[PDB]
Design a protein around this ligand. Sequence first.
Ligand code: SF4
Length: 76
Amino acid sequence: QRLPVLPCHVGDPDLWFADTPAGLEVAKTLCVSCPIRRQCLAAALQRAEPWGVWGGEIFDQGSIVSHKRPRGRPRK
DNA sequence: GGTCAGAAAATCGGTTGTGGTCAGCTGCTGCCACCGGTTAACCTCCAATTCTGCTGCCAGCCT
Ligand code: SF4
């Protein structure tokens, strides 16, 4: 079916929870071409997923952050 | 025009705090399900054929 075209499970699944701001960036933008962004993002927002890339967007424990804040002192 | 204390990020983890929450009985209380005993005019005996082997039976020579 359309399973190998689905960009979620094409490669290694441990990529999409890597705890670097730059590592998961290609994981987030790899769901640009995903055919099911609407329903996946809708399910992720309704069930309140606390981790990882969902619907081509990252998640905190309840909501969506724009980009994950890096380790260290943030920029003034 | 470079080194050292403080501030500010998640991050892994302990506290903690209470706010319900669900169950675990626990009486307990009513009830309900189930088992056992009892009834004192009289009237006291049932509703097909084919083949093989076994046993019961009667005349009848033999002693
Ligand atoms: S997170 Fe995005 S890319 Fe991954 S399966 Fe869901 S919609 Fe597709």
